[PDB]
Ligand binder design. Structure first.
Ligand SMILES: CC(C)CCC[C@@H](C)[C@H]1CC[C@H]2[C@@H]3CC=C4C[C@@H](O)CC[C@]4(C)[C@H]3CC[C@]12C
Ligand SMILES: CC(C)CCC[C@@H](C)[C@H]1CC[C@H]2[C@@H]3CC=C4C[C@@H](O)CC[C@]4(C)[C@H]3CC[C@]12C
Ligand SMILES: CC(C)CCC[C@@H](C)[C@H]1CC[C@H]2[C@@H]3CC=C4C[C@@H](O)CC[C@]4(C)[C@H]3CC[C@]12C
Ligand SMILES: CCCCCCCC/C=C\CCCCCCCC(=O)O
Ligand SMILES: CCCCCCCC/C=C\CCCCCCCC(=O)O
Ligand SMILES: CCCCCCCC/C=C\CCCCCCCC(=O)O
Ligand SMILES: CCCCCCCC/C=C\CCCCCCCC(=O)O
Ligand SMILES: CCCCCCCC/C=C\CCCCCCCC(=O)O
Ligand SMILES: CCCCCCCC/C=C\CCCCCCCC(=O)O
Ligand SMILES: CCCCCCCC/C=C\CCCCCCCC(=O)O
Ligand SMILES: CCCCCCCC/C=C\CCCCCCCC(=O)O
Ligand SMILES: CCCCCCCC/C=C\CCCCCCCC(=O)O
Ligand SMILES: CCCCCCCC/C=C\CCCCCCCC(=O)O
Ligand SMILES: Cn1c(=O)c2[nH]cnc2n(C)c1=O
Length: 389
């Protein structure tokens, strides 16, 4: 078949992806700009990620279409066309890693979060990561390239000028760079890092949920103990273990609820020390009202916050996971090309599918926010509804 037919399918799909990438990610940026409830440090990395995905539609996909033709070009110009997408992919990895660390700090040291993680510091991190993304993605331009060993047969067969090559990705970008440097070091290692961070996030959330439940059962168990104890030392032992358990919970109207609880325990405790057991039990039984009134509400709000954080972190993890799914095939095909030179090159149609799937990643982020985060979903509706209506 004439190549122009298969290439017409490839180009049409690439342009379709470019349109979806631009529209969806413009909506993400628009949403964060308008809605103050979306303006947090976490979402500044989301916007940086959306900007990279817009750039895939506006620049990388047109570059990808161009380099598929093998057009004649100065090798360093070709290199820039071939490698710019690597800058955007690297920026996305830094943004994904930053989001994971952000959510980890939020769950592990909430008290210190807003003091550590600020808009000003985030903006600085985003600027540094973009600079590093240019350095990593355009490393071939610094001399790690095959511009020095041009394919002269292809150059003259295609009728290129001198100094010019048939501009093809695999002719100009070295496969050792793509496999060892780009894939293993700059992509795979950060992805495994994010896996580790997210693991630590879910473990932290699970431990804090358990601790909450433990304090609640420990406050309820020791109550029953006091109600059935026939000795003043039994009441004292239990009440001392409730005071500790209450003071851990305090740190972990609610602020008043705790002062009442500690006070009522201190009351029932001084009675117990004086031998007044029935009076200690009577004083201990008022804790039920403080528990019903205040403690049960603080337990349930704190449980609600942790669950919201587990949801947000799962949402972020899906986006990191989707990046991996969409990019691994292209990276794995490169590994086969590099490591198995006795293996037939992956056919053109599968190369096209791998490239298109990597580009498709720049579409998916907006759907995940829409499906998994109400605050974005609501703002999407309002930006669409107030432009339709
Ligand atoms: C839209 C704005 C922000 C940036 C767009 C600039 C892009 C389109 C420019 C910047 C550098 C340019 C390249 C620089 C040099 C060459 C070598 C020449 O033999 C063929 C064209 C080619 C490969 C150019 C293609 C277009 C190019 C990639
Ligand atoms: C989730 C992480 C661990 C995924 C990364 C695994 C990658 C690096 C693995 C998965 C399958 C592997 C390939 C399987 C088979 C072959 C054929 C052999 O002749 C050369 C190595 C080569 C080409 C391997 C290279 C590395 C490879 C691509
Ligand atoms: C879900 C993701 C992470 C896994 C996808 C793995 C894909 C990329 C794997 C599965 C089987 C693989 C193919 C198995 C055998 C060959 C023949 C060889 O001559 C060229 C590479 C080629 C054609 C491989 C290319 C990559 C391949 C298609
Ligand atoms: C993944 C997301 C949707 C992909 C849509 C279908 C993919 C098309 C890639 C282009 C290859 C099609 C094979 C036709 C022959 C050829 O291209 O040589
Ligand atoms: C440089 C070339 C053009 C880059 C295209 C991407 C632009 C990103 C737009 C940023 C959106 C602003 C969000 C508002 C906010 O974060 O407070
Ligand atoms: C190519 C250069 C990259 C272009 C744009 C990325 C900027 C988007 C970052 C938004 C930061 C929002 C903020 O924290 O104020
Ligand atoms: C928006 C336009 C999208 C892509 C532009 C593709 C240009 C292809 C260049 C081919 C030139 C040649 O074959 O010599
Ligand atoms: C915004 C700017 C949009 C312009 C982008 C278009 C690029 C296509 C250029 C392709 C060059 C055609 C080669 C002509 C020839 O060889 O005769
Ligand atoms: C903000 C929009 C920016 C413009 C987007 C369009 C970019 C087009 C990309 C590459 C076109 C360059 C390839 C054409 C060179 C042909 C030279 C030749 O005839 O050998
Ligand atoms: C902000 C956007 C600024 C970008 C302007 C870029 C211009 C690069 C055009 C020059 C490259 C073509 C020269 C190659 C040749 O003549 O062979
Ligand atoms: C750390 C971030 C560093 C990023 C800045 C890099 C600066 C050095 C790059 C200079 C460009 C070399 C041109 C190569 C050439 O002309 O062949
Ligand atoms: C969806 C499609 C997946 C294709 C996976 C199998 C690749 C077959 C290539 C074998 C060959 O090159 O002969
Ligand atoms: C043209 C290529 C189209 C690429 C778009 C593909 C997927 C976007 C949606 C991402 C998955 C979320 C929806 C999950 C579901 O309910 O199936
Ligand atoms: C990122 N990337 C690759 O890793 C690759 N491998 C072969 N062609 C490729 N192309 C066109 C590409 O854009």
């Amino acid at each position: 078949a004439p190549p122009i037919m298969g290439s017409s399918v490839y180009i049409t799909v690439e342009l379709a992806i470019a349109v979806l990438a631009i529209l969806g990610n413009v909506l993400v940026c628009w949403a964060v700009w308008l809605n103050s409830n979306l303006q947090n440090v976490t979402n500044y990395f989301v916007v940086s990620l959306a900007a990279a995905d817009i750039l895939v539609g506006v620049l990388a996909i047109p570059f990808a279409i161009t380099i598929s033709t093998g057009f004649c070009a100065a090798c360093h110009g070709c290199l820039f066309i071939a490698c710019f997408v690597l800058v955007l992919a690297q920026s996305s990895i830094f943004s994904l890693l930053a989001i994971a660390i952000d959510r980890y700090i939020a769950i592990a040291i909430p008290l210190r979060y807003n003091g550590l993680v600020t808009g000003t510091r985030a903006a600085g991190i985003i600027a540094i990561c973009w600079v590093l993304s240019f350095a990593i993605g355009l490393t071939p331009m610094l001399g790690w390239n095959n511009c020095g060993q041009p394919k002269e047969g292809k150059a003259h067969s295609q009728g290129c000028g001198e100094g010019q090559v048939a501009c093809l990705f695999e002719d100009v970008v070295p496969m050792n760079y793509m496999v060892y440097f780009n894939f293993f070091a700059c992509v795979l290692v950060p992805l495994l890092l994010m896996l580790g961070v997210y693991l630590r996030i879910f473990a932290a959330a699970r431990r804090q949920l358990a601790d909450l439940e433990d304090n609640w059962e420990t406050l309820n168990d020791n109550l029953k103990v006091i109600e059935k104890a026939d000795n003043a030392a039994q009441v004292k032992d239990a009440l001392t273990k409730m005071r500790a358990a209450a003071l851990d919970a305090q740190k972990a109207d609610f602020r008043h609820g705790f002062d009442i609880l500690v006070g009522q325990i201190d009351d029932a405790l001084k009675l117990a020390n004086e031998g007044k057991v029935k009076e200690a039990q009577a004083a201990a039984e008022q804790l039920k009202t403080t528990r019903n009134a205040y403690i049960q509400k603080y337990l349930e709000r704190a449980r609600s916050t942790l669950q919201k954080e587990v949801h947000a972190a799962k949402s972020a993890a899906i986006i990191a996971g989707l990046f991996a799914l969409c990019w691994l095939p292209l990276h794995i095909i490169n590994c086969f090309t590099f490591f198995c030179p006795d293996c037939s090159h992956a056919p053109l149609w599968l190369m096209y599918l791998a490239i298109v799937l990597a580009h498709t990643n720049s579409v998916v982020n907006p759907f995940i926010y829409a499906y998994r985060i109400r605050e974005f979903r609501q703002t999407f509706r309002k930006i669409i509804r107030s432009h339709v209506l």
